[PDB]
């Protein structure tokens, strides 16, 4: 693993590391930079969300600015900030392992057009010349006709629809809300059947808030987004209806309970997941059993049909071999509490997914060449000298 730190927004379109691809099947195109195998960075804002949002639909605690990340200088600053964050993550063994798993964890490929994953058909080519005595018609080379016939679902398409580039993750800028890190999938159907799909990430590294007596390192937020994406890559996303109670709305004069998805709790770390996820397990659902069964089925398919086949490139085979080396329980047991200990990073640990109600955030501007290095915040997480952002006057407040 080596993060490419030799790219800039002015880099030429070489169609190998810097590309101009299409956003899904819409009419827009955007520029992407590859900083690692199957990992791309797109500084421009996310195409999905519309930049103009009616005041009715704006959410509490959000910052809206349709002019952010419009100039090239901001884009280059964002790209360099993302590369710096990735280098900081990879500077530690845990980060290197996580990034390697992300790169190798390609979505499972679909079978041949006819069906199955066993073997392709054969063809012959190159009939030899008619010898003096023997016709030599049958003396010819044998080829697997649909070599690498495995159909893939993780690819970005060029504007001409005549070229495709591999990609598992694509880190975009923030959408309509300037401060809202998010992770979205490419195909909902493939994120739950165990096949997996590519993930898109919206990240904002230029703003952070102060909790208690320390600042929040954006690397932790990026790691959280990557862990959430891991679920999409393995196609083990639970149904949106699998929620659990998270907090009792005491302030209300009614019996109302706030709910959180299982993935968010399992990933966000903190103390909340410790009461759930006990020995023995007091909370259970068919989701875990179905996921384990499908994972075992896919592993058996790979071991009995993929390894033997000699008519497909190793780029997919070796990655799939390493993808299934780990177990689903390892992913479920992976949370921010491990990286906090590994990186010695302080983060909110109680109800960190519902901090909007408890106290209002004040945002500070981060200059990355200066305030943040490959070793984290300059002068530490406590004594870093940052400046309050000028966007704090535009925070939406809907009680």
């Amino acid at each position: 693993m080596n993060i490419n730190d030799n790219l800039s927004i002015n880099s030429p379109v070489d169609n190998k590391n810097v590309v101009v691809v299409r956003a899904r099947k819409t009419d827009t195109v955007f520029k992407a930079f590859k900083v690692a195998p199957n990992i791309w960075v797109a500084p421009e804002r996310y195409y999905g969300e519309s930049l103009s949002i009616d005041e009715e639909y704006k959410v509490d605690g959000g910052i809206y600015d349709s002019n952010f990340l419009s100039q090239d200088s901001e884009k280059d600053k964002f790209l360099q900030a993302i590369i710096t964050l990735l280098k900081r993550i990879n500077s530690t063994n845990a980060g290197e392992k996580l990034l390697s798993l992300i790169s190798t964890a390609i979505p499972f490929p679909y079978g041949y057009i006819g069906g199955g994953y066993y073997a392709p058909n054969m063809i012959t080519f190159g009939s030899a010349p008619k010898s003096n005595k023997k016709l030599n018609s049958l003396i010819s080379s044998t080829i697997p006709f649909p070599y690498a016939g495995y159909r893939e679902t993780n690819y970005l398409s060029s504007e001409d629809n005549k070229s495709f580039y591999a990609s598992n993750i694509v880190i975009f800028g923030p959408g309509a809300n300037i401060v809202e890190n998010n992770t979205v999938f490419y195909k909902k159907e493939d994120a739950e059947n165990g096949m997996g799909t590519m993930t898109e990430i919206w990240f904002q590294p230029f703003l952070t808030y102060k909790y208690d007596e320390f600042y929040i390192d954006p690397a932790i937020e990026l790691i959280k987004c990557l862990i959430k994406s891991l679920y999409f890559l393995y196609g083990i996303k639970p149904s949106d209806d699998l929620v659990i109670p998270y907090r009792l709305r005491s302030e209300l004069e009614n019996i109302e309970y706030s709910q959180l998805n299982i993935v968010d709790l399992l990933v966000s770390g903190g103390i909340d997941p410790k009461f759930i996820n006990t020995d023995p397990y007091w909370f259970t659902d068919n989701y875990f059993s179905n996921a384990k069964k499908v994972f075992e089925d896919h592993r058996n398919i790979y071991e009995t049909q993929i390894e033997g086949n000699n008519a497909i490139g190793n780029d997919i085979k070796l990655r799939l071999k390493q993808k299934f080396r780990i177990n689903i329980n390892d992913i479920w047991e992976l949370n921010l509490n491990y990286f906090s200990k590994e990186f010695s990073i302080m983060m909110p640990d109680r109800f960190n997914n519902a901090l909007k109600h408890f106290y209002r955030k004040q945002y500070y501007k981060i200059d990355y060449p200066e305030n943040y290095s490959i070793n984290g915040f300059v002068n530490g997480q406590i004594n870093v000298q940052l400046s309050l952002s000028d966007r704090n006057q535009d925070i939406i407040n809907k009680p």
């Binding site: 041949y112 057009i113 069906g115 058909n121 054969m122 063809i123 012959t124 009939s127 010349p129 649909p146």
Partner: protein
């Protein structure tokens, strides 16, 4: 320039058309001494790029509809893979240069008024290729015409196919499956794999690979209620053990080596096997169905501007005359079996009020 009646027409000029300025875009090869060089292509046909050239009156949709209405479809049927190869042996002491290009079928739509073509639209559909070779000593000057083509030309076939754009059976009641032969091909070159022109002293080959579970038969039923595709397929399996999946793993190829005197033109089509499933109640044929199963192709050798009319839709048989008739037990009735063999006498008690079958065997040969 045209003897047809006034109105709009659709014309096919046949395969073998080579475009201009596209000679060497696919690269070339160099051979030395006695080495033999083979160059060819093998496409899945999934990616198709027909070249359109429309007119105000003739738009893309108009051309596509009016063409696929008669000639071979190239949108959804452009899925069968294609493959071709050419091979040349260089002389003892010299060097050979070979360069390859694609060949296209040229379709046209024209509007004739007062016996003169006043509007023309063009469509080019990829079909096989063509290889040009030259033996050169170092420093030899080559005529530019061998490298650069400045006008489209017909190499293999010069044709003009136009269309106006406006017995007693002594059988018994019951099902029957008749294999009526092999080598069936649709008319108007709708199954044509293509034609190859091998220059003197060279060799050429046309290959027809097949993807698994990707074979399309042709089904025509006079009553979808009784003779459904599943029903006729099941009856075919019962009578002959016909299964579609086994025709997808096969592959065939035709090879021709031209002499040193003249060139050789080889034309290759896909073929079919015709199975007629019939019901022969009361002596007539109440229902009938035709099932055409992919065969291993058919080939012919030509030897190289009369206008011709597109023939009516139908099939032409190039294989030997054949008619194999096999009866099949009607699935509607039920079959019961008598385990014990009939020794010298038996009185089997009928086990319904509907027609049925009784299956038995004789424990000793003799007249019963």
């Amino acid at each position: 320039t045209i003897d047809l009646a006034d109105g709009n027409y659709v014309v096919s000029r046949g395969d073998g058309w080579i475009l201009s300025r596209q000679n060497q875009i696919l690269g070339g090869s160099v051979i030395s001494n006695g080495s033999t060089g083979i160059v060819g292509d093998l496409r899945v046909n999934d990616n198709a790029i027909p070249y359109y050239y429309p007119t105000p009156s003739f738009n893309e949709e108009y051309i596509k509809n009016n063409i696929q209405t008669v000639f071979a479809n190239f949108t959804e049927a452009n899925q069968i893979p294609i493959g071709f190869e050419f091979s040349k042996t260089a002389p003892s002491n010299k060097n050979l240069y070979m360069y390859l290009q694609y060949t296209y079928i040229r379709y046209e739509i024209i509007k004739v008024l007062q016996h003169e073509i006043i509007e023309r639209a063009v469509l080019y559909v990829p079909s096989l290729g063509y290889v040009k070779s030259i033996e050169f000593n170092p420093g030899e000057k080559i005529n530019k015409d061998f490298y650069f083509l400045t006008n489209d030309k017909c190499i293999l076939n010069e044709q003009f196919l136009y269309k106006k754009i406006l017995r007693v059976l002594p059988y018994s009641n019951g099902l029957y499956v008749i294999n009526k032969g092999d080598g069936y091909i649709r008319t108007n070159d709708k199954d044509l794999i293509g034609t190859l022109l091998i220059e003197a002293g060279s060799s050429g080959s046309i290959i027809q690979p097949r993807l698994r579970n990707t074979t399309r038969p042709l089904f025509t039923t006079s009553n979808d209620a009784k003779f459904s595709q599943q029903y006729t397929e099941e009856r075919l399996k019962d009578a002959f053990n016909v299964q579609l999946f086994n025709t997808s793993t096969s592959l065939f190829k035709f090879v021709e080596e031209a002499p040193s005197n003249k060139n050789i033109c080889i034309k290759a089509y896909n073929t079919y096997e015709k199975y007629e499933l019939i019901d022969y109640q009361n002596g007539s044929i109440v229902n009938k169905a035709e099932y055409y199963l992919p065969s291993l192709g058919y080939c012919e050798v030509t030897n190289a501007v009369v206008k011709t009319q597109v023939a009516e839709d139908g099939f032409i048989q190039n294989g030997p005359e054949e008619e194999i008739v096999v009866g099949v037990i009607d699935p509607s009735e039920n079959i019961q079996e008598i385990n014990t063999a009939i020794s010298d006498n038996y009185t089997y008690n009928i086990p319904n009020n509907n027609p049925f079958y009784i299956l038995f065997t004789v424990n000793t040969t003799g007249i019963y």
